[PDB]
Amino acid sequence: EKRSKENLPWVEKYRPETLDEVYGQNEVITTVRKFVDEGKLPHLLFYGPPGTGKTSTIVALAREIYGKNYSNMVLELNASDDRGIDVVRNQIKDFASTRQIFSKGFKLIILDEADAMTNAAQNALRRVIERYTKNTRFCVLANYAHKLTPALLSRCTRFRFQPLPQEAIERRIANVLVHEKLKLSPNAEKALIELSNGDMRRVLNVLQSCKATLDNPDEDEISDDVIYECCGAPRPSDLKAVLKSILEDDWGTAHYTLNKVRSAKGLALIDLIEGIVKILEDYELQNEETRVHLLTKLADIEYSISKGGNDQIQGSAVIGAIKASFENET
Amino acid sequence: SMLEAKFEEASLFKRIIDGFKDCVQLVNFQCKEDGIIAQAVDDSRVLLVSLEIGVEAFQEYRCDHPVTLGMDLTSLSKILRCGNNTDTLTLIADNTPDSIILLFEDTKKDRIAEYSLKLMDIDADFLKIEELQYDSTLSLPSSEFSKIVRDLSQLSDSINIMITKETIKFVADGDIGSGSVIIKPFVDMEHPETSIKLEMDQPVDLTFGAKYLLDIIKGSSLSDRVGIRLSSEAPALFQFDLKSGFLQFFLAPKFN
Amino acid sequence: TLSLQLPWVEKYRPQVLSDIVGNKETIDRLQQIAKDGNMPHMIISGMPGIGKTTSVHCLAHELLGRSYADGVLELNASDDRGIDVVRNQIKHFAQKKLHLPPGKHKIVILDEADSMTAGAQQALRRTMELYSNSTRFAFACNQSNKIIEPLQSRCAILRYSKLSDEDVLKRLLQIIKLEDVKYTNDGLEAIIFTAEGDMRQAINNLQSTVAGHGLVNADNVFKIVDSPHPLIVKKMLLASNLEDSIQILRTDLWKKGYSSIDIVTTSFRVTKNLAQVKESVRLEMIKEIGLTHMRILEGVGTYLQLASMLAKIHKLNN
Amino acid sequence: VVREEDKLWTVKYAPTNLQQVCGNKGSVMKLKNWLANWENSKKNSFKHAGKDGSGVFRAAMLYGPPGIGKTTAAHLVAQELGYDILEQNASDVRSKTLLNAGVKNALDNMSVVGYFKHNEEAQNLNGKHFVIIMDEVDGMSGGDRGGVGQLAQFCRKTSTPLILICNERNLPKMRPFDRVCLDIQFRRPDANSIKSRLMTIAIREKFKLDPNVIDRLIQTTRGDIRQVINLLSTISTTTKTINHENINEISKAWEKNIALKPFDIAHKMLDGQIYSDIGSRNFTLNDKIALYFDDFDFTPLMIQENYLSTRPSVLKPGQSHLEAVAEAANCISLGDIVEKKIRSSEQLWSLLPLHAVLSSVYPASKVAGHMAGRINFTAWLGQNSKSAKYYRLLQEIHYHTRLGTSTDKIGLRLDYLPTFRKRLLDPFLKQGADAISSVIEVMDDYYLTKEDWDSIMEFFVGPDVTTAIIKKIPATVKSGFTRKYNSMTHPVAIYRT
DNA sequence: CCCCCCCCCCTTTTTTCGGGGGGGCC
DNA sequence: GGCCCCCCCGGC
DNA sequence: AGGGGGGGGGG
Ligand SMILES: Nc1ncnc2c1ncn2[C@@H]1O[C@H](COP(=O)(O)OP(=O)(O)OP(O)(O)=S)[C@@H](O)[C@H]1O
Ligand SMILES: Nc1ncnc2c1ncn2[C@@H]1O[C@H](COP(=O)(O)OP(=O)(O)OP(O)(O)=S)[C@@H](O)[C@H]1O
């Protein structure tokens, strides 16, 4: 890095350095701590969605096992590096079959993002794993399990990283506020959690954007309005009004309301559709085909939007689909 | 260790091995109380190599019981290349030999190099080579024989040796003209080495491939005078006389 | 804190053919061949983690005694197994002269042979044929269709079956007694249920439990080992009502961290292997799942697409 | 040295002479006759073909399914005739460079081993003559460069008998061997041609083998005597009785799996039995997907070609054949879209299983039944090649006339070509040989050549075909036109094309 | 020589990046 | 020993 | 499925 850590992005500035700074994975953290505290550390397969803390967890585990000079005693290979059949055959085999250099210890290999590896390399790694197990251990981090061969999966103990719970995100937010001397309104916190979807990177990015948006962070408190302005996401009140107008009001006034709501803050149609879907998922419908039509038509509209096209036609289609689906209620 | 054969210098053994290394891939050695014998058959089943070394070439030779050793040229050549050419070379073989031991001994720097060469299982039994009544016998120096073979191989892929009364002709008619070399018996008192000698019995006209002759003449530096024995219908016998023993090539002639 | 303990998979790896569970007929046949000698060329096929490599290693060790080091040539996917290697090193090993007991032969163990190229397999044919009096070949593969027909013709066939619940359970009791592990019946049943016949996974789960919680029970096993997601996908696809399927997808799949691509792939496989459903209905569901998969691969990996796919499947099956 | 009870049953009970070879008697007799009259053909320069037709081929190409005894028969016939066997196999590098320094010498040279082994023998005129055996020709891979061509040249400039052994003959790599060797085909031996041998083996090995269950074993091994011998050796290790009580288990456990050919795949996939309620439980959807994957580069084409020539038996009540055909065509179009997406820059090969259903399984499930005629190989490849050639010629013509015309190749084909025909072909049919000057003037104005003329006149279709019209043109007119074209200089539009 | 079961075997090439293998120059 | 070039799979 | 081809039985 350059200068100091204050110039780093919040996503990288607040990267955990030890295992006790990882939140939302109490079971996995306790299990790995117990494993590394009594010498029985098996091969690990950390499977989870982005932003859960798998890389941070493995880095902290390596630091605890080896210490400050852990970078020179582990072999970290990721998608950014070339990992082919020849690499597995030569470099990984040599690392697993050779003693340590700086200090006595066992060999650790971290194959981050191994789901992007070829099948030949995965097949080759089987005997490398099963032959040098006495002095070497393997850790594989993945987001999609279908990319891993069954043979590789059989040789690794599986640990699943769940989406971050609400309390963990609140604790991390409180720590960040304490470090940055910032104040957050409770409604702003709830909106941040709602839009976070269990990813801490989104929390940090949105919080940094909100801090940058404030006129003076020293004596300004971030509110839900600030978060909505920074992210441009529709407000819940706007979504409720749009849904109400679509459901009860006629075509002309519903179209006018949708246009006015979208043009007031430059809202995007996809976010409105997502919010309407979330709101309607809790509706106690009396018929099934109505829900079927809603889901199918909204998925079609989302797919069409993903490829671009006329936005006004897409909004009219959304309104018409909702009206037609709710017509079946009778 | 019933077999122990010591060469004062490994150069002799290396020169023996590499003289027929480029024509065969598998060799069988029989070690007896009277010395070493060896037979090799090429992949194409055309060129046969026979070899024997008497007890005179060994400063020390002990062989309680006869033994057999199957060897490959590549591994033996590599092992020999590892050692130098100015050290005593000891070949050691025990009962029921699955491998042989090569000892490179340097008595000035006190250096010992031990190599183990794994033996190969070869089914092929030795062909009974019987003394043939060769019609034509010729003895010529190795140097000019190698020269003529190398020069004529560039003009044709198969050359015809014709032996007639006081005439030995090497016809090399092919793609490049029809250049040929004709020689006659000649005796030099001052230089007995260059003495072409002819034992004419019956006319001979035999065609032989260029590649086999090129491979055979590779041993010209090994010896000084080469003896070519030809018959009406039989493989040419190219005898390379040794200090104790000799090296023989049998080359089957081409049809018609 | 740097002295690793040997995992139970390697610590308790069988060293004799009598310690291998499952596939009784094949194990007794291998034991009889080892006792009587004259081991023929063989190809052993089966799913991962059932004891093929262990079986071949034990057979070779028992057959060759102290000559294992000089009489066994082991090559796997982690070593160079090109056409040149087969043409030179394997030929040299086969032609090697090694004195062995009268009833024994040299052994070449080509593990994970399914990854070998066609040229090497073609070149191996006459190598096995000519030198069958001194050297014998034992291949271990996961997919038997990757081996050329001539090699299968020259070799016996040993198709390992799936380990039964009783055999895995018995091995678990033996290992627990050896390690003096406190266990309960429900915990062992859960471990076997999650293993799905994979002994290696069962051993890994049994070690992770006790290594992390001490005592084995259903809750301890389930809090670290998750139920196989294919079963949850099958349950979701077989839901009587759309609401139940949506709830299952939201609670057990989406909120547990499973990716949409994995979910759609698992749904594809489950629909591929659903016997209770009619073939035509299965084909329609496969078409819908393929449409959803194509949509996801383009970038729209949203829960909305999965919900729409479930709704369309329910409409088709109505 | 080698104990008699420590050898594989295949080597222990290998045939000792040709009389012990089971099955394919006619092929054995043909090969023996060919090898027993090679000298006479050589004296005749392989010109006077005999009644059997084996007097003109100096090489033999033996082919058949694996494990039938081609190599054994070849070796035994070579031994019985007194020839010296020189075997080249797949475990030896057989590239063009290595072959040029190898067997060429032995093809026209006598053997030294034969001379030094049969010297004391009499009447053994064949002991000194080489016979070349090239086993596992199909086994040559990228490691052997230019071996097929070298062998093809060998089969025609060979001075010694040559016998080639292979497992697959329909493969394109065997095309050079089409008409340069005597083709000898070995069939799968019948269950009655090996009954006596198998009973003898069972008696010798002291295990009971019930004759009534013998056929199934061959049905399990599918003509592989080596495989059934290995099966017997393995089963007899612990089970000393082979009866109907355990035949089913061993048959199921030792079933051989061989990928079906595209024609067989099309025949099986277009069968209505497997798509029935009872058949589906035997041949499942996974089985159909595996059948497709046996050859995924040909199965969709065969299905698309042969789905219009069936008599469906799975038609829904009230559904007609045409409706099922339309549904199959729609599914085929969807599968084509999926295939296009698969081979894009993203290389989405994970969609291959889906392409199995949308291209082969589903369309066949709607028209499954009995074929109304012979199965025809897909004709789309030839049509695609012809269209590519036509597009290349059209591009050449368009860029030759680009300086004069204001249009694209599509516009040139759709609009300009009829008008051009009105000036370059019509006046030859009215004024005879007096229209040469005008045609040459048009060519000069549009930088056209005679080859361009041929290409243009070959594009027309429908009732405006020009082949018959061109052929009916008098030869004198065409000769005069060619002479006039070749007797003057013409401008060139593109330089160094 | 001529005819009738019983079965076997053959009817056949185009393809978008990225990775791997194996041959040829040097 | 190193580029450079050509052919061939790619799902479970 | 349609057509060609080899081998055992009848003639
Ligand atoms: N459990 C966590 N506790 C605190 N911060 C976290 C946690 N998880 C993620 N983060 C934060 O998000 C940042 C990125 O975390 P990562 O370790 O990169 O997640 P990841 O699971 O490795 O992403 P993938 O699966 O490779 S895309 C960290 O530097 C932390 O600042
Ligand atoms: N039949 C078995 N009996 C006892 N333990 C077994 C058995 N099979 C597998 N295991 C255990 O699981 C471990 C691994 O077995 P493996 O031999 O590696 O399975 P595998 O079928 O060879 O795996 P693949 O196909 O090469 S991925 C063994 O060391 C044993 O501890």
Ligand SMILES: Nc1ncnc2c1ncn2[C@@H]1O[C@H](COP(=O)(O)OP(=O)(O)OP(O)(O)=S)[C@@H](O)[C@H]1O
């Ligand atoms: N007609 C036969 N009769 C008796 N045994 C046979 C016969 N054919 C093959 N075998 C047996 O199978 C063994 C090997 O036969 P092969 O000649 O190698 O088969 P193949 O026809 O050459 O098939 P490929 O192309 O080499 S896989 C022989 O030693 C015999 O024991």
Ligand SMILES: [Mg+2]
């Ligand atoms: Mg990461």
Ligand SMILES: [Mg+2]
């Ligand atoms: Mg294994």
Ligand SMILES: [Mg+2]
């Ligand atoms: Mg064979």
